[PDB]
Structure formats: C-alpha cells, structure tokens
Amino acid sequence: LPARICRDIELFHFDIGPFENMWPGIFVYMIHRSFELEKLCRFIMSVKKNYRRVPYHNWKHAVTVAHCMYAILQNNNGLFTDLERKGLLIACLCHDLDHRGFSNSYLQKFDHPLAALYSTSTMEQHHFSQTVSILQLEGHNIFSTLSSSEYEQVLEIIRKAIIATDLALYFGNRKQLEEMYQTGSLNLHNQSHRDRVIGLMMTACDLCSVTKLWPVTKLTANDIYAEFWAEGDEMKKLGIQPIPMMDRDKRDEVPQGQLGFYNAVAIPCYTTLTQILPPTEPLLKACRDNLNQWEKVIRGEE
Ligand SMILES: Cc1ccc2nc(C)c(-c3cc4nc(N5CCCC5)cc(NC5CCOCC5)n4n3)nc2c1
Ligand SMILES: [Mg+2]
Ligand SMILES: [Zn+2]
C-alpha cells in the first residue's frame, strides 16, 4: 500500500480517501494486521454490493467505522482476543448493510414489514441477518478454517456488536458502564461487562466522524443532514410532523443541534471510553476540538 497510507492509517483521524477501489485493500490490510484471501475479497465485494447509494450510511461509512475499530484495537494490544478482533472488524464493515437512509422510528411509523419482524433495533437485526446470508453464499464463508464452536462464537460477537450500533441502546449502556467505572466494579474478565465495553466501542467507531479533523467533520455533517432531512420529508408525507433534527425548515439551527449532540451523546461517549481504555484519548481530544469549532460557528467566526 502507498507509503503515506501505510503511515497515516495508524492515526485515529485518518480519512480513507475518495477512491472506492482502494478501500477493500485497506480493510484487508487492517484485518490481516489485526483469512482465506480469495473468500475474503469475495465477501468484501458482496458486502459492498449490499450497501446503498445513500449520502451517509453507505460503503464509505462502513470502512471508516471499521478503521476506527482497527485504531482502537492497535492502541490496546492484548486486551481483545484474535477472534474478537476479527468479529469486531467484520461487524463494523457490515453493521449498516442495506441501510436506506431512514431510522427505526420511520420504519415503525411507515409500518414497514421489518418492524413487524423485528420490534426492537429493527434495522440492526436486519443487518445481522443480511450479514449471515452473505456468509452463507458459496465461496463467502471467511470463517471456514474455524471450528463450529468458534464459528458460532464469532457470529455472536458480531450480532451483539451490530445491535450495539443502535444509538437508542447507547444511553443505558454508557450509564451502566460509567457507574461500574466510578464504583470500581468494572471487570473486563466478566463477559457481560466485556460485552458492554464492546458496545461502547461500537458506538465510538460508528460516530467517529466527530473525531476527525474539522474540515472532514464539517463536510460529513452535510451528508448526515441530507439523510435526516429526507426522512423529515417522508414523515411529512405520512402526515407526521418530524423532530427538528429531521426538519429541513430548521437547518439554520444546525450548529445548536450539533452542540446538543456533542454534549448529550458524543463527549460523554468518548469520555467514558477514554476512562476504560486510556489509549483512546485522541478520539476525545478531536471530539472536544470539533465541539469548540461548532461553538465558533455560532459566534459567527466559522
Ligand atoms: C457524524 C454524526 C453521526 C451521527 C449523528 N447522529 C445524530 C443523532 C446527530 C444529531 C444531529 C442533530 N441535529 C439536531 N438539530 C438540527 C436542527 C434542529 C436540531 C439535533 C440533534 N440532537 C438533539 C440532542 C438532544 O436531544 C434532542 C435532539 N442532532 N443530533 N449527529 C450525528 C453526526
Ligand atoms: Mg446505523
Ligand atoms: Zn453506521
């Protein structure tokens, strides 16, 4: 891989660039550095094909989330098993499979068939189900050299991690982790605690846009709102007044909305993550920097 990417990929704030045909080799590099090479590529290409041309929750997003996981895992050597590392990187690549740019709330209000099938964490459950189906295509079982027991195990890791990208679950998960940390009861050798930490890692990776340098973070914000505002339109088509976040009428309040989001979700997230895994600190610093940028925008300086 290019010398610059070889080096810069180790940075938390790395951007994977605009060349799509480079991203598979970035993922393969990361996952080799953290498989049957033919099956892997085959698997990656099918996953890519199941992603949609939507502004934010797309193929680029998936590799970006996977990269963040890579960086966390590299800077916390010895904490997670070889399996967990494989499962988590795959989970990240697959977590938004078949995303159509709408939230679980809209699918519910639309009375989408997936909401009858999966009452809770609707999209996330469907994404895992899609992932399993891709794995079950001829020549796509990247876990073929594992035993059945380890196969079942890695799928379980993947399922929980994908489900954890439902931001509705973040709030209780992080609250529980925070109290475990502050009381000294947090035990990484406890599987249930360990699952929670992985959940928070998944949230941290999924939101990692907010931990890039400002020019990246600033531009990506256009992508998330393009999805959010289209959902607000569809909500209005259902005869339902959307929440401000998804109302394009309220686009002038975007800086204030971002402030809200960083204060309520993103800062607490990386703060807790940094407490549990100190080497993730750069994610929190970059997040804090971006919060400061949004504050300057509101002052009319940016
Ligand atoms: C990069 C990234 C990734 C995920 C994100 N998820 C959310 C939910 C948000 C987000 C956006 C937003 N916009 C808001 N408004 C814009 C104009 C009116 C309000 C408001 C919010 N969140 C408020 C925070 C407190 O509860 C009320 C909603 N968010 N969040 N940003 C993300 C950014
Ligand atoms: Mg998602
Ligand atoms: Zn995502």
Curated annotation (Swiss-Prot):
Induction: Up-regulated in brain after seizures. Up-regulated in the hippocampus one hour after induction of long-term potentiation. 3',5'-cyclic AMP binds at residues 57, 258. A divalent metal cation 1 binds at residues 61, 95-96, 206. It comes from Rattus norvegicus. Homodimer. Residues 1-301 form the PDEase domain. Detected in striatum and testis (at protein level). Detected in whole brain, hippocampus, olfactory bulb, striatum neurons and testis. Keywords: Allosteric enzyme, cAMP, cAMP-binding, cGMP, cGMP-binding, Cytoplasm, Hydrolase, Metal-binding, Nucleotide-binding, Repeat. Belongs to the cyclic nucleotide phosphodiesterase family. Plays a role in signal transduction by regulating the intracellular concentration of cyclic nucleotides. Can hydrolyze both cAMP and cGMP, but has higher affinity for cAMP and is more efficient with cAMP as substrate. The active site is at 57 (proton donor). A divalent metal cation 2 binds at residue 96. The keyword Hydrolase applies. It is found in: Cytoplasm, Cytosol. The lineage of its organism: Eukaryota, Metazoa, Chordata, Craniata, Vertebrata. GO terms for cellular component: cytosol; extrinsic component of postsynaptic density membrane; glutamatergic synapse; neuronal cell body; perikaryon; synapse. This is cAMP and cAMP-inhibited cGMP 3',5'-cyclic phosphodiesterase 10A. GO terms for molecular function: 3',5'-cGMP-stimulated cyclic-nucleotide phosphodiesterase activity; 3',5'-cyclic-AMP phosphodiesterase activity; 3',5'-cyclic-GMP phosphodiesterase activity; 3',5'-cyclic-nucleotide phosphodiesterase activity; cAMP binding; cGMP binding; cyclic-nucleotide phosphodiesterase activity; metal ion binding.
